Design a binder for this molecule. Structure first.
Ligand SMILES: NC(=O)c1ccc[n+]([C@@H]2O[C@H](COP(=O)([O-])OP(=O)(O)OC[C@H]3O[C@@H](n4cnc5c(N)ncnc54)[C@H](O)[C@@H]3O)[C@@H](O)[C@H]2O)c1
Ligand SMILES: NC(=O)c1ccc[n+]([C@@H]2O[C@H](COP(=O)([O-])OP(=O)(O)OC[C@H]3O[C@@H](n4cnc5c(N)ncnc54)[C@H](O)[C@@H]3O)[C@@H](O)[C@H]2O)c1
Ligand SMILES: CC(=O)N[C@H]1[C@@H](OP(=O)(O)OP(=O)(O)OC[C@H]2O[C@@H](n3ccc(=O)[nH]c3=O)[C@H](O)[C@@H]2O)O[C@H](CO)[C@@H](O)[C@@H]1O
Ligand SMILES: CC(=O)N[C@H]1[C@@H](OP(=O)(O)OP(=O)(O)OC[C@H]2O[C@@H](n3ccc(=O)[nH]c3=O)[C@H](O)[C@@H]2O)O[C@H](CO)[C@@H](O)[C@@H]1O
Lengths: 308, 307
């Protein structure tokens, strides 16, 4: 049976991927420093799961972690963009050095396939208000966004120089159960859903006309598995957005209706780094992956709410 | 008034150090002497202070920027091939040094930093075209990716912390003190050293390849202007002349300068080699005072006479 190394596997997206891989019969090895990930996210009783608690930028740890692994999904990163603005030096270790050290360890070990969580943040403000195609000029505005893009560039280098097979996925806005709502910079759906469940007010920054391309985590997991099992994945990046349009006001009304409870909306100012419109051009995604029928926003919110 | 020059002991840096001291600045050099040479510097000049260490060393940078009014950040492992062989080590020199410098400058309240980026950030894009600054990026090596990431971090510190970066993408610089000892040394330093020594040269390909060569003294004038301009633009500026020199042109000009015909061994074209590389230097012409740059023959003659 094949073993998948999942860096960041104890986190939001990672733990769902772990469940899905194990269910398909893979062995899984999680490498996670539990900075935001949680052991309670993992099915620790599954005989197919191994857990290594440590830093994904640690070369000695990666040399151990890759031994006996057949492929990698590289999800470890400090996901809070704001955290990278606060401390560029520390987050650069997690957001880029981990990628570089993983490439070195995979090349030594002879492992080719790595699926990488890049981000729509690499586009910055370019193409705003239009479906963003993958060849849109990049404009990373924070250390996080620059490290995700630099990670792409190094993965492509190891592909050409050393025969790595990277599957570069630029996530748009992923949501669903286990997304941690504890920070003011947690994903807005995790925050809004937590308040609605508790019956407490939410805070809307700006006028609510901002749009995002929301993706339910279960649909992202399908793509991640397919990137692991593809016979010859494309070299260049693929957006993971649906090409959908959801305003924050759309989201407020959908969530309120799902909770069946009234929802107080207090106001805050638009946050300084807030992009107003964000939507993916889904054409490469639809060409390269089988999305089937994705979850609509309502279906995804419902599953999230019904889990809390 | 004092200028920090990281990499000041190297080829471009030491020429800059000469120019800045000649203009009355005090000059502090930070260099690990990996490829820089103390013999490149005017030791014994009362205005020159040399620090030897790693430009990625946080504690050392903190001392180094203290009392400085501006910075020229030239320290890097210039060999693209060295970054291919050792991405981990060269990333410290080619990117981490930039990030640490940003942090040290912010803490000390120093705004102006002139940065040596590279035409390598374009990859093969714009082959056969005047390369404008918005030409799509495609860094092919760790070195090129680190130069581009350096640019992005410099822009973030500008917006978030009031830094004033002057981002310059160098095309093919040449001149005295350019090390010809490596096979991946610049073709002009190699061809000239072999011409002076009367030894054969090796031409990879047909010699129709073209490059936008820039004499080091003209680059130095731009570096100094970047320090002294009152309100520099935020985005990158290509440093090239928009010139077109073939390798066969270069061989002919060296044969005319040396007075003896060069024996030309034929090698196969290098894998991935860009055939035609030319800057669109409109932004340079607009933002800087270029005067009359040295022609290739002028630069070659000045180089050859120095060997
Ligand atoms: N959720 C989104 O909308 C979104 C959008 C774009 C990109 N991403 C990327 O997707 C990946 C997963 O993000 P997530 O939403 O599940 O958030 P998350 O915080 O739940 O997952 C991050 C995980 O990585 C781990 N981690 C962090 N630094 C580490 C280190 N140095 N060593 C080892 N483990 C480390 C954390 O403990 C956590 O388990 C990340 O790379 C993130 O940047 C997510
Ligand atoms: N045509 C060109 O020469 C060219 C083209 C594009 C970019 N550049 C850039 O211009 C700058 C100068 O290059 P150069 O041609 O003068 O080469 P160089 O090797 O002569 O100068 C580089 C200097 O940096 C120093 N250095 C290297 N790593 C260091 C570290 N970790 N800490 C401190 N000092 C360190 C070296 O000792 C040397 O003195 C570099 O940033 C290079 O990447 C040059
Ligand atoms: C990835 O960043 P991205 O901005 O896309 O995602 P986020 O989930 O952090 O924010 C989405 C939008 O919701 C807004 N928002 C977020 C949190 C909140 O409590 N209230 C609110 O109105 C944000 O300002 C933003 O406009
Ligand atoms: C910076 O890369 P860039 O290629 O622009 O610069 P280089 O100086 O390394 O080489 C320029 C050209 O000269 C060629 N070349 C270089 C060295 C040599 O001994 N012979 C030769 O023919 C190269 O193949 C290339 O075509």
């Amino acid at each position: 049976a094949e073993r998948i190394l999942v860096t960041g596997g104890a986190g939001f997206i990672g733990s769902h991927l772990v469940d899905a891989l194990l269910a398909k019969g893979y062995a899984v090895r999680v490498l996670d420093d539990l900075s935001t990930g949680k052991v309670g996210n993992l099915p620790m009783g599954d005989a197919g799961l191994e857990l290594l608690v440590g830093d994904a930028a640690d070369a000695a740890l990666l040399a151990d972690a890759v031994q006996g692994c057949d492929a990698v999904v590289h999800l470890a990163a400090v996901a809070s963009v704001q955290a990278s603005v606060e401390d560029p030096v520390a987050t650069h270790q997690s957001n880029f050095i981990a990628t570089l050290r993983l490439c070195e360890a995979m090349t030594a070990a002879g492992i080719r396939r790595v699926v990488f969580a890049s981000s729509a943040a690499v586009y910055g403000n370019n193409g705003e208000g239009t479906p963003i195609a993958e060849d849109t000029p990049k404009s990373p505005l924070t250390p996080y966004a620059a490290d995700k893009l630099a990670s792409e560039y190094y993965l492509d280098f190891y592909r050409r120089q050393h025969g790595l097979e990277p599957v570069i996925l630029r996530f748009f806005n992923i949501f669903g159960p286990r997304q941690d709502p504890s920070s003011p910079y947690s994903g807005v759906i995790s925050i809004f859903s937590e308040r609605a469940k508790a019956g407490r007010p939410i805070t809307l920054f700006g006028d609510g006309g901002q749009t995002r391309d929301f993706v339910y985590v279960a649909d992202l997991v399908k793509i991640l598995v397919q990137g692991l099992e593809s016979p010859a994945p494309a070299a260049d990046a693929t957006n993971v957005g649906l090409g959908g349009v959801t305003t924050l006001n759309d989201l407020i009304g959908a969530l309120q209706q799902i909770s069946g409870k009234p929802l107080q909306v207090s106001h805050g100012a638009t946050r300084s780094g807030d992009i107003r419109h964000s939507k993916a051009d889904n054409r490469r995604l639809r060409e390269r992956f089988d999305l089937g029928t994705p979850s609509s926003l309502a279906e995804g919110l419902e599953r999230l709410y019904r889990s809390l």
